[PDB]
């Protein structure tokens, strides 16, 4: 109801100099006015799509918070079609910010995405919705698969960190923003039935650039520093990569990307908008089940001769070598039996060695046959399918290496396979869950800068940046940005110490996984420090 | 040899600022205390709670929390509280001294300011116990157990803790909370005795705050932003804020007006508040009347109902739409029937018909001989959030040439009264964007305009919020340590007002949601100087 | 381009530049992620020691403990508790030659990290670790080996380099005391815990961010050290003595399960919502609750009252009606309802706490293929308290009934749960059992409350959804200021904090009444940190 006597007695019962924590002198700031400015741009096909935006106005003193709008068209026709999650980020191949004196800042599309991955709002705007990312089906040539939509891509820049204090100042200079787009093939998930040829011919990127402009009265410009991300991709299947000309790096990131060039980029399933590891696994199990347990009158027809479809015993247990599969379906008609496809997908490099068989990954399958729809309605499924199984390209099941067929699904099931060309996949699975780096070594010149076995550098990245999707990262700067010059690793060119060399030991994937034959590329990102000066327009100088 | 050199700082090689040590300043001597007050209740019979803060030792205060003791709800019928029940109770909050109002806010604006604070919304409260629609079976059955909810009354005094705190220049502070009618916070069916509940219900509030007893306080003048709201006329796409001299921001949004309805909806998902939960609760409510397993043509439906026996094929054609219906274990003496016009809307006898039965493409299930019900399995439909937000009144409106609610009397009896006061847009999730274009005028000159909702995208990015509004921010300067940046008036040139004009998106006249009345809401934050000369006072910056 | 109205509104007074800053040159330093193996020592309590000393490691912060979990092989049910890595920790101590610099009890470290979802995930929390897995053969793999990471949050992390621990050419020892592995594992009777316990060893590794600083200019600082007092079992009071400069005081309750075998009917695994706990429990009871049998069901104790369901579908258990309807029941069989599955009472013709009475509707379909009932819709009033009742309390001496009338199959599936960080009297700490709280500074009442308004403030101020009744005395920003504290008056006897609570009561006929409670009181004392002749701390008085 009021302050207690014990508290009152503990204070009254003034000799020392105290900092006022109950009042502040409200400083008058620089006089300015912000404005959201939107620009249309010019489209070019060098046949890569490139959008240019020129910002040249005597009243736009500073700017930040770049947002790119993209108009997605109405998608009509036959077939399965869906956009990749965060489709807007996946459109971007490269972003460049330039003045008359050259590039001020630039970034690779995947690195922009990596920098925004911990911003759920920016990712949502990108966008990510059941409307965009579920795999929709067109049943007629004039059927609407996808309605037209607008996505917003937040182009995070070093100018956003401290709002007005970090904004790009325009020294009565012309700024150009150049966005290079990925082919539309990257952002779209589709089956064979979908007329991609026509879609590709007719699709056009329709972008618009927004930014927060500031009209500042008597701006007092000071020099600053900015970090420019630089990326190097290693050779296919080489466990090494080098970044040359490293003189002042604030950080270094290391990750892996799969390379699907030895494939047709076709996968059995995709979960759509639902993106959890369990959603990927459930979408895959769901696609296999129709061919795995068959309720038929006599041995099931329409499967390759290589298929081993066995009638389930009265026991319910089918033995596929060491693995027992318990199959029990209720309401099976008297003229019909329950069959198990014991080798739905199988892989082996040697005829009497190890076999990777997807049918062996199921231990229990129960359900009820429906006389009304003539389908089996699966109830409980016990299995050991993982995220890697859902990430195996179909090409690797039917590869030359494989001594077996070894894709014994029905023709109906194979026609439902999807082309996935997402350009920002990491690791060897869709969720980048499996850590395939067993050991990492970083060399600065000839000296070992850092080495680790487990991903403790990923744990630090995730803790320090409050991200649940980090990468193995070394950070050399722990100083607050903008108010301090960033701390860096510094070169010694005479001792040949001006290169960062990364070496990894990859995990053997275990014994005979078809995912061992997924080609990998090592990615190394280095953040170089640059000085930003505004003497005769905006200019940047690499720190050396 | 598989060993690797383990050497430290191998990447290492004037006045420098020390980043490894700091001089720990001695702060003002103070002592905080959590103080709780009961108030005085007063009653167009609107409930008002007053709390008077007067103590020579409370030097400053912040972090206001209002407690509310919700009563035990007994009786027959369906009852549930709206999500974030405690915020929806608040009509208005006012903080006053002897010199007048220091700060005040409309209930919806307090809620909009706390929408990103998941903790404060949970305390509000939001739970299965409060928000699921509970059913009372006997007149002495307990529908809802008594409960306490906490409403964090976010004020400008919390931004920088002690630095931004409200200083009581040995003045009396009065906090006045105006409550919304209990009708607004309760979701109920016709069976529930609302008349008695309303007569007997009383708001039981308590105000807490963090008080600070400060030794030799050195008070300095400061600035405060006071939110000011203007609501446009029904269906008017314009609104004006007059006497704008120093504004830090301007927000624009839409609210539906349900005065042309009885505020009854077919369904409500309860505690589960996702778009999918709203859609699933609605589909679930329609399914008992949509697919019927009956011995002969189903009874108990209006004559306007067109209930058709499903062919051996399983496909029923409703004009251009094919509905595949297949139910297992149907008894031999019975057939499967499909309600082909459960809900239908047309403005002309030969116009386009909006039919909810046409929104279903596949319905799978098993009839239960034990419970004499159909247990639905897989449903393929195209029901959206707008369908679940249609008031029942609009389906049976004078503008409809059809009946056009052909549901059973049992289904219509399960309809719920929803009077949530903080609904935005034309659907429960505020998913549909109905503003096609926005123009903001400062005087007669165009300050800002947009076609797409880029100002909402910026609001959401800058405030890290997933529920933003079209907002124009003029202040990008850090709060408390600087005088806020404002849009400033030119009275001589007539630039002393903010006029908002929107262009609403169009839609077909044959969709019941076309008849939802809309109100434009404009929120302006005006800058005020906080003085302490003879107790606390605020002065509008002009 | 900028509109004319904006240009016209702009185009003697000192203005602060908000569009440019002079980029200060910081102290020259170089960070490094350093990892150390320690020394393992053995109540045969496991203790890991890590010694940090290097002429170039000047400062450090952001301690992360790695734990290598082994491959778990054999027969039976096994799972790790959620946040396994935090639950491993009994105590963490940071020491110099001059003594302890900072230390914390494992539960208080966990409490400090509970609002950090990333740190908790790294702990870890996954279906792989936390679902209850089953081993079918003696060489079957129940759990694959895994690594967990425990972020050991310290006061040195608040302001990165500014708050970092400086090493004045001193040797810093980090000592981690581990809980017995019995605390972090959820297992059934079938699992060979004896062998697992004998063979299990903690395999830890300590990482930290080390800083090599050129010409470090050290300044004295302040640190808050958490101090915990646990009250006598069921005693609603606790005292913290020698309180001279405290920044906060926290109060909470813990259950004590020493009067039990720590066995529970169910556990939801990785799925940790209140509903997941309730659904896992209902699921475990269902196969004994509704039985499809040819004649009266066999294999239940003589005390079991299994009744054939009438044609009506309604079975009356006193005042409670249970509607049971199962489809596809074979002609030679009937539907039976177990009317006293679990029952508890302290007198014979009095009140009965009966779990079977908590069900109002049960629907399902019998499966001829698997000879099971596949349950569909269930209407019950089971709560989080029911799922938190140890099995021991159903069959206790106070109970005049049997009163666990489940099948032997169901009882064999019971799980040992020894999670060391449970609060309240239920697994979710949902039930508030403190009716009133009083805090005394000396003999004077410092604070008192009925409702948990101090928990509401804790949750608001720390942006946490799992707060405790807390009194904060410090609202001053950390590192840049000396913390504000409650200060002692030794002459007036105000140099101690006494807590008294009034517990709510659940009835004497509820098995949960017999769950023992412990009052926990946490006090944060202010200490001065000085670096004159190694690192040392001094209690503020």
Residue numbers in the entry:
A (entry chain B): -1 to 11, 14 to 46, 50 to 547
B (entry chain C): -11 to 1, 16 to 45, 49 to 547
C (entry chain A): 0 to 10, 15 to 45, 49 to 547
Q: What text comes from the article?
A:
The crescents are covered by a protein scaffold that is primarily comprised of the D13 protein. This protein has no predicted trans-membrane domain and requires the N-terminal region of the A17 integral membrane protein to form a honeycomb lattice on the external surface of crescents and IVs. The crystal structure of vaccinia virus D13 reveals a double-barrel organization that consists of two jellyrolls (J1 and J2) decorated by another β-sandwich forming the head domain. D13 forms a trimer with a marked pseudo-hexagonal shape resulting from a parallel arrangement of J1 and J2.
Here we describe the 2.6 Å crystal structure of the vaccinia virus protein D13 and establish its membrane remodeling capacities by analysis of 2-D crystals and reconstituted IV-like particles using electron microscopy. We determined the crystal structure of both native D13 and D13D513G. The two models only differ in minor loop movements although several loops could not be modeled in the native D13 structure because of its lower resolution. The two structures have an r.m.s.d. of 0.5 Å for all equivalent atoms. In our model, residue D513 is ∼14 Å away from the adjacent trimer. The 3-D density map generated by electron microscopy also reveals a large gap between residue D513 and the closest surface of the neighboring trimer confirming that D513 is apparently not mediating a direct inter-trimer interaction in the 2-D lattice. Thus, mutation of residue D513 does not appear to directly destabilize the fold of D13 or the honeycomb scaffold. One plausible explanation for the assembly defect observed with the D13D513G protein is that the mutation indirectly induces premature or distorted self-assembly of D13, sequestering the protein away from the poxvirus assembly site. The surface-exposed residue D513, which is in a conserved patch of D13 is available for interaction with a potential cellular or viral partner. Thus, mutation of this residue could also disrupt an interaction essential for the docking of D13 onto the crescent-shaped membranes.
